[PDB]
Enzyme design. Structure first.
Site, PDB file in Angstrom:
ATOM      1  N   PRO A 104      42.040  94.554  47.340  1.00 40.57           N
ATOM      2  CA  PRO A 104      41.674  94.043  48.651  1.00 40.57           C
ATOM      3  C   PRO A 104      42.541  92.836  49.042  1.00 40.57           C
ATOM      4  CG  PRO A 104      40.156  93.159  47.011  1.00 40.57           C
ATOM      5  CD  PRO A 104      41.259  93.912  46.266  1.00 40.57           C
ATOM      6  N   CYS A 105      42.364  92.348  50.259  1.00 34.71           N
ATOM      7  CA  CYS A 105      43.230  91.313  50.761  1.00 34.71           C
ATOM      8  C   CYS A 105      42.703  89.914  50.399  1.00 34.71           C
ATOM      9  CB  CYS A 105      43.363  91.471  52.259  1.00 34.71           C
ATOM     10  SG  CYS A 105      44.513  90.340  52.912  1.00 34.71           S
ATOM     11  N   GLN A 106      43.420  89.223  49.504  1.00 34.63           N
ATOM     12  CA  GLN A 106      43.051  87.867  49.069  1.00 34.63           C
ATOM     13  C   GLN A 106      44.225  86.891  49.176  1.00 34.63           C
ATOM     14  OE1 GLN A 106      41.286  89.374  45.245  1.00 34.63           O
ATOM     15  NE2 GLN A 106      39.505  88.166  45.870  1.00 34.63           N
ATOM     16  N   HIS A 146      49.082  88.050  57.129  1.00 31.61           N
ATOM     17  CA  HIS A 146      47.958  87.371  56.503  1.00 31.61           C
ATOM     18  C   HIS A 146      48.360  86.007  55.903  1.00 31.61           C
ATOM     19  CE1 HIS A 146      45.134  86.681  53.092  1.00 31.61           C
ATOM     20  NE2 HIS A 146      44.250  87.052  54.005  1.00 31.61           N
TER      21      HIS A 146
END
Length: 368
Positions: A104-106, A146
């Site tokens: 996932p996006c971290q 991001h």
């Protein structure tokens, strides 16, 4: 029984792969479809694990499951050197030709140590420990933007430093071939970024690019209507109370009309379980009458409905039009969450198709 069954070519497989953060098997389905054998799966969500097992053949003699990836990589453990961690990883994860991960996006708040504190670090530790010939990572459509481009930069540097060439690594304009939309295969909006890596020493990438993905599109994309069941149960119609709530709210939901064969749904989200708001199926509502008088008795016979779990499984590619093969052993709410958290299966069947000749080269190389 209703137990999943081995494929036709069992017990002879074309290659081996692992399946990290697998959810309910989305990426896995593409790779099985070119004769791959899953030898390891990792997934923290127990309900998801349940659905995965009801739907994929997992022989405990050649395959195993892990819940918490850190128990294998030891990333939350101090005083464990990189090499002892690597050796411990190899006890649990077997050799494989292709590594698949939907991490996932971290943010890399702590910024191969720039990535510590994130699952991506676990992924990279596993890649280092096992050196797969290829990998395929899957992530949010806006990975490049991001945390002000920090996250993508770090990810791409770390992959390069592992000794991998990533497909279309130097094309990050607004046309990035890495961004792939599920809408070309199934009538739902769904862009994701896809990172396909090739171990540099095998010299395998050659002319591979994701631009060629367009060659995998279907001549005629199935319509939304064709994915719908004829009779649906009453419970899927919105309650008077919710419809009015949602309708008022929109005056200060995404309706789909299935009789329009071109209609493309909004993304089926993780949020979908709450109300179904993003994708409602019209059942003959008359907008004039609703604006005239919202509680009109005949119009109130025509409130929109939610998608059903079976229809979500079709909209993600787990289930064919008109068919009901995908076993859903969880509550409706659990099924909505799992479908809204998966990848679109034919996206990754197509990536697997473009890889199949490379993977064959790779298997043949190591069989020497």
């Amino acid at each position: 029984t209703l137990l999943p069954k081995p494929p036709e070519h069992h017990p002879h497989y074309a290659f081996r792969f692992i399946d990290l953060f697998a959810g309910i098997g989305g990426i896995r389905r593409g790779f099985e479809s070119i004769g791959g054998q899953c030898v390891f799966t990792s997934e923290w969500n127990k309900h998801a694990v349940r659905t995965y097992k009801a739907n994929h053949y997992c022989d405990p003699a050649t395959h195993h499951f892990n819940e918490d990836i850190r128990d294998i990589t030891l990333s939350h453990q101090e005083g464990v050197s990189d090499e002892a961690a690597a050796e411990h990883i190899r006890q649990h994860i077997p050799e494989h030709d292709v590594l698949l991960a939907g991490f996932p996006c971290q943010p890399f708040s702590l910024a191969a140590c720039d990535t510590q504190g994130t699952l991506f670090f676990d992924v990279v530790r596993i890649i280092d420990a096992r050196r797969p010939a290829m990998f395929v990572l899957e992530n949010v459509k806006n990975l490049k933007s991001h945390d002000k481009g920090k996250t993508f930069r770090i990810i791409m540097q770390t992959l390069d430093e592992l000794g991998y060439d990533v497909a279309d690594a130097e094309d990050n304009g607004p046309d990035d071939p890495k961004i792939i939309d599920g809408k070309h295969f199934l009538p739902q909006h769904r862009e994701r970024i896809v990172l396909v890596g090739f171990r540099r020493d095998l010299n395998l990438k050659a002319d591979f690019t994701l631009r060629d993905i367009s060659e995998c599109f279907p001549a005629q994309r199935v319509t939304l209507a064709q994915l719908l069941d004829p009779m649906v149960e009453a419970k899927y119609i919105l309650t008077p109370v919710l419809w009015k709530y949602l309708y008022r709210y929109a005056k200060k939901y995404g309706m789909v009309y299935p009789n329009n064969p071109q209609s493309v749904t909004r993304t089926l989200s993780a949020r979908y379980y709450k109300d179904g708001a993003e994708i409602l199926i019209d059942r003959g509502w008359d907008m004039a009458t609703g604006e005239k008088d919202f509680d009109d008795p005949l119009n109130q016979q025509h409130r929109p409905r939610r998608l059903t779990p079976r229809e979500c499984a079709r909209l993600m590619g787990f289930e064919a039009p008109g068919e009901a093969k995908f076993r859903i052993p969880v509550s409706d709410t659990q099924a909505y969450r799992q479908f809204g958290n998966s990848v679109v299966v034919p996206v990754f069947a197509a990536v697997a198709k473009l890889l199949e000749p490379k993977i064959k080269q790779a298997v043949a190389l190591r069989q020497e």
